[PDB]
Amino acid sequence: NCVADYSVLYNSASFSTFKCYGVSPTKLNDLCFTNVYADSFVIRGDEVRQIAPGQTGKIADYNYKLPDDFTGCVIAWNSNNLDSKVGGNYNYLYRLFRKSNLKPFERDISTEIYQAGSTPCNGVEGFNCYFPLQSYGFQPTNGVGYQPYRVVVLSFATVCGPKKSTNLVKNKCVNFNFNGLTGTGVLTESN
């Protein structure tokens, strides 16, 4: 239920990489659709390479699966100056292990100790069983592949892009389009 200026994101100078995976970036004004959800998170720069349609590895298999048939887009930008700390900004959390492979758009927030091969386990994470949650200690001195990137995903009726309007020429023979009605004529101020 809003008009979505999506191409202004694509034309802005701040973002480091942006791509779309069911749509071209010039058609981002022409889109109209029922509902969408926007996603956001902070991740390491070389691991953003997993955050495209259908891919494998770490985030894509154990946190956040994108499908090969993703009608959507992803936008990513460097964030050292706010999202890294000299002591390592361990507030950001990632999953290293989980059974099965995630369904596209699947989320999980529960955890149990991983028990690879076969063993019982009740805390401690000592031998053959592992706590799967880990923290990302981002530091302002990291090499580019380990620097923090701010990342957004767009999961493409109520939401058309911006409907462009021209100047309005009066007293002349003109072709015209007013909302959805088209014609040709002379336009004059009525009483």
Binding site: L96, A116, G117, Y130, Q134
Partner: peptide
């Protein structure tokens, strides 16, 4: 068995 050793050393590397 090897996936225990993989997950144990993947955890060492992280």
């Amino acid at each position: 068995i090897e996936e225990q050793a993989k997950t144990f050393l993947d955890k060492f590397n992280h």
